Design an enzyme around this catalytic site. Structure first.
Site, mmCIF file in Angstrom:
data_model
loop_
_atom_site.group_PDB
_atom_site.id
_atom_site.type_symbol
_atom_site.label_atom_id
_atom_site.label_comp_id
_atom_site.label_asym_id
_atom_site.label_seq_id
_atom_site.Cartn_x
_atom_site.Cartn_y
_atom_site.Cartn_z
ATOM 1 N N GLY A 57 25.959 -26.071 149.589
ATOM 2 C CA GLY A 57 25.826 -24.815 150.343
ATOM 3 C C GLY A 57 24.785 -24.667 151.311
ATOM 4 C CB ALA A 58 23.366 -21.935 153.165
ATOM 5 C CD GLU A 59 18.359 -23.765 154.858
ATOM 6 O OE1 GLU A 59 17.824 -24.818 155.339
ATOM 7 O OE2 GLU A 59 19.280 -23.307 155.280
ATOM 8 N N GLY A 60 20.078 -26.301 150.759
ATOM 9 C CA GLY A 60 20.026 -27.222 149.503
ATOM 10 C C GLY A 60 20.966 -26.974 148.333
ATOM 11 C CB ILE B 106 24.756 -28.414 145.181
ATOM 12 C CG1 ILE B 106 26.076 -29.087 145.174
ATOM 13 C CG2 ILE B 106 24.109 -28.337 143.592
ATOM 14 C CD1 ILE B 106 26.062 -30.284 146.301
ATOM 15 C CE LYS C 230 28.540 -18.023 155.063
ATOM 16 N NZ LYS C 230 28.398 -19.436 155.422
ATOM 17 C CG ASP D 290 26.256 -14.958 154.290
ATOM 18 O OD1 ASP D 290 26.905 -15.109 155.411
ATOM 19 O OD2 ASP D 290 25.867 -15.692 153.677
ATOM 20 C CG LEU E 41 37.274 -23.192 138.869
ATOM 21 C CD1 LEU E 41 36.693 -23.608 140.340
ATOM 22 C CD2 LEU E 41 37.033 -24.236 137.835
ATOM 23 C CB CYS E 42 37.988 -19.452 143.388
ATOM 24 S SG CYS E 42 37.406 -17.776 143.080
HETATM 25 N N1 LIG Z 1 34.090 -19.918 142.948
HETATM 26 C C1 LIG Z 1 34.005 -20.923 143.388
HETATM 27 N N2 LIG Z 1 34.742 -21.865 143.176
HETATM 28 C C2 LIG Z 1 35.246 -22.954 143.863
HETATM 29 N N3 LIG Z 1 34.564 -23.597 144.983
HETATM 30 C C3 LIG Z 1 33.255 -22.892 145.449
HETATM 31 C C4 LIG Z 1 32.961 -21.315 144.673
HETATM 32 N N4 LIG Z 1 32.017 -20.863 145.140
HETATM 33 C C5 LIG Z 1 31.766 -21.507 146.167
HETATM 34 N N5 LIG Z 1 32.583 -22.685 146.147
HETATM 35 C C6 LIG Z 1 32.342 -24.103 147.284
HETATM 36 O O1 LIG Z 1 30.960 -24.249 147.625
HETATM 37 C C7 LIG Z 1 30.669 -24.254 148.978
HETATM 38 C C8 LIG Z 1 29.338 -23.716 149.470
HETATM 39 O O2 LIG Z 1 28.758 -23.079 148.496
HETATM 40 P P1 LIG Z 1 28.190 -21.350 148.719
HETATM 41 O O3 LIG Z 1 26.870 -21.234 149.026
HETATM 42 O O4 LIG Z 1 28.821 -20.610 147.465
HETATM 43 O O5 LIG Z 1 29.200 -21.234 150.101
HETATM 44 P P2 LIG Z 1 28.592 -21.231 151.693
HETATM 45 O O6 LIG Z 1 27.537 -22.112 151.446
HETATM 46 O O7 LIG Z 1 29.696 -21.561 152.485
HETATM 47 O O8 LIG Z 1 28.210 -19.747 151.625
HETATM 48 C C9 LIG Z 1 32.262 -23.516 149.665
HETATM 49 O O9 LIG Z 1 32.358 -24.351 150.594
HETATM 50 C C10 LIG Z 1 32.999 -23.611 148.559
HETATM 51 O O10 LIG Z 1 33.833 -24.695 148.808
#
Ligand SMILES: Nc1ncnc2c1ncn2[C@@H]1O[C@H](COP(=O)(O)OP(=O)(O)O)[C@@H](O)[C@H]1O
Ligand SMILES: Nc1ncnc2c1ncn2[C@@H]1O[C@H](COP(=O)(O)OP(=O)(O)O)[C@@H](O)[C@H]1O
Ligand SMILES: *Cc1cc(-c2ccc(N3CCOCC3)cc2)cc(OC)c1O
Ligand SMILES: [Mg+2]
Ligand SMILES: [Mg+2]
Lengths: 386, 383
Positions: free
Chosen positions: B19-22, B24, B129, B127, B83-84
């Protein structure tokens, strides 16, 4: 070829098990979690939603299964339930059921507690059986828990199931019927399968007859004396004789090793500094020589007897001298000859097991004869009042 | 090597994404259902649980994801969420993707309704997007829906390089309306951002530079979608419509809804003087939308049948609308030739006319803004 009936959902080909009177349980889904869906004929079985709601509105108990939601099809009825790994039957019977990793006695603690949670809500199961005691799927670090199910439902036009029905329920209900049922399932668990009543066909006949076997419970073994003592009362024909939901939780049958030891310590302290004439002490030697095996001194290991000979001052004809000796030895344990520590220790498991090994009626006798002091501030972890 | 910090649990080998800023996200567990657990460093982001708790204590919205429970490691912070299947990215850009099952405009609708529900709760996403709009795994009968995520948390500037409303650099819902405008375009364009390529994205946004190159003026749907998005990506925060205002926009209408609008308007405009301010406002755009003479810009059967009654001016908007409404009404008794050219109602029909007069609905809509408060025109207009 799946079915819906919205807000719940399932596939009919994945059937788990058929229950009484034409009811069926499959593996369905809900949000996305794997679920067991029980499908029931509304004319046969009667869900009581009020009770279940009261369960929901009150603090969630870890050993009482949760019902996800209820909807009424025209010709049916549908329930979505946490898909459990098994029922008590798989546990005690299959033996291959890789626990994990729970003991049968804690299993009975769980069960009795959950049941107690039900009874606090003035709610009675009416049908407690090994099929209505389910085992979770393994959790995070793999541990297993036991919950009661099929509660708050019944039959129109006797509840419960052949074999597990209290005597009084078969002669023209309170918690007691659940305590009787529970005594039976206690025996079914402890005894690795045997029913106290005892074979399937004759089981209920003997329930009304009052026949019990209990032959798995020797008299030379501590734990068996305790189990027998409790179950004896749980399956007592007179419903007034059956112990309450909490009362059963409070039994020695459930105590940890440490708790038993501490019991012996506390008792030894509280009986000390009182006259031999006093009610407590005189009562404690009532069964007397019987439990002690005449004199306890010769019935114990050698090193321990050499130390005791060095110190005593211990009659041996008295249980009280034994208790006091045990409390002294437990207390001063660290500053003891290493051989002594080798035979006695470790504290508290092996220690207390060393004495209950050799005096199977000790804890029982003490516990009963010390009922006198049931109200004292110390013993509310040990005894019941109201 | 399973991790606990109960009640959440995960395998650090089944990572879903950085994700953003470390931070995961891994695929973990909860009760016994698969979830996604994203771990964050509590030193970077600040959770406001009053907001999420308020989400819980309010009505369940079908397009707002749910954070199950929040708990704190000694050194970390863990959020377990539904979970998506994917993010808007895989929806748009993966050529072999199963929607299944759902149209893009229904997607945006869902997104905007969830967004409006969030705004109703006086909580600002801050935020918005694509990654923060998510696609659910198939449901009961297979149907996928979209839910918005990562809301309620901020950074210790919110937003993301590309979607951040300009005035936040120089906060209210207007920001989310703007980001939303961006994602609207992004979706409808099948991959393109208005502002418009990655590195300049935020330069071009502080600029005011738009693209909107894929929206022609000869296709009705384009003119409508544009008409909205423009107001959504307006550089003046007070210009952007509210989250519901966006929903009430013709962009979201069904064909039945569109034709119903046309008929309602045609019934209303009639029996009002032609000098009248409503009709005059209606014919302000005039010829251009009507393509000089709308009589000459329809099929030949329809015009050879409209010859027999007209009465139909043809330079005039009201007359086209009223011819539509009349030919609609008397459809049963029309020659099979004419029935056939128009096509079945309301689909083929309202499409028949919207094909040929792309600006007609946009124009009649804007011109009919006059009667927005009227009890018949409230199913069409903002308050
Ligand atoms: N509920 C979820 N189910 C499956 N994958 C996810 C879910 N939430 C986030 N992700 C995955 O985590 C990645 C980055 O985490 P997150 O911080 O939530 O999104 P972003 O950093 O893009 O805002 C995304 O690219 C996405 O693929
Ligand atoms: N909640 C559940 N989860 C998983 N399996 C179950 C569950 N409840 C019942 N079963 C299985 O389905 C069968 C039918 O159970 P049920 O309908 O409760 O009737 P009974 O109480 O007579 O067993 C049982 O034998 C049990 O093995
Ligand atoms: C088993 C037992 C032990 C004692 C006893 C043990 C240890 C001590 N001390 C004090 C002096 O030496 C160091 C540790 C004292 C007493 C006493 C009795 O009872 C006579 C006993 O039964
Ligand atoms: Mg059952
Ligand atoms: Mg995200």
């Amino acid at each position: 070829r799946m079915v819906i009936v919205g807000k719940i959902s399932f596939c009919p080909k994945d059937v788990l098990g058929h229950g009484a009177e034409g009811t069926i349980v499959y593996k369905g889904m809900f949000d996305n979690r794997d679920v067991a869906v029980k499908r029931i004929l509304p004319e046969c079985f009667s869900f009581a939603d009020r009770e279940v709601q009261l369960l929901r509105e009150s603090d969630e108990h870890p050993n009482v299964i949760r019902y996800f939601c209820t909807e009424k099809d025209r010709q049916f009825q549908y329930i979505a339930i946490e898909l459990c790994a098994a029922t008590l039957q798989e546990y005690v019977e299959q033996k291959d059921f890789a626990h994990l990793g729970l003991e049968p006695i804690t299993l009975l603690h769980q069960t009795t507690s959950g049941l107690a949670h039900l009874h606090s809500l003035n709610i009675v199961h009416r049908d407690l059986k090994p099929h209505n005691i389910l085992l979770s799927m393994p959790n995070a670090h793999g541990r297993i828990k036991a919950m009661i199910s099929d509660f708050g439902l019944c039959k129109k036009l006797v509840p419960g199931t052949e074999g597990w029905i209290a005597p009084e329920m078969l002669s023209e209900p309170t918690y007691t019927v659940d305590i009787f049922s529970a005594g039976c399932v206690f025996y079914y668990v402890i005894s690795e399968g045997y029913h106290p009543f005892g074979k399937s066909l004759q089981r209920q006949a003997n329930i009304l007859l009052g026949a019990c076997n209990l032959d798995c419970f020797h008299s030379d073994k501590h734990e068996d004396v305790i189990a027998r003592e409790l179950i004896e009362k749980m399956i007592a024909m007179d419903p007034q004789q059956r112990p309450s939901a909490k009362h059963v939780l409070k039994h020695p049958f459930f105590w940890s090793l440490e708790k038993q030891l501490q019991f012996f310590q506390d008792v030894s302290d509280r009986i000390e500094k009182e006259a031999l004439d006093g009610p407590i002490v005189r009562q404690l030697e009532r069964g007397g020589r019987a439990v002690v095996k005449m004199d306890w001194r010769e019935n114990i290991t050698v090193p321990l007897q050499t130390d005791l000979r060095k110190f005593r001052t211990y009659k041996g004809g008295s249980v009280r001298d034994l208790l006091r000796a045990m409390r002294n030895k437990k207390h001063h344990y660290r500053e003891l000859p290493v051989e002594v520590q080798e035979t006695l220790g470790s504290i508290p498991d092996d220690f207390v097991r060393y004495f209950t090994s050799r005096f199977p009626h000790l804890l029982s006798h003490t516990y009963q004869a010390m009922e006198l002091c049931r109200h004292e501030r110390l013993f509310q972890t040990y005894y019941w009042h109201e």
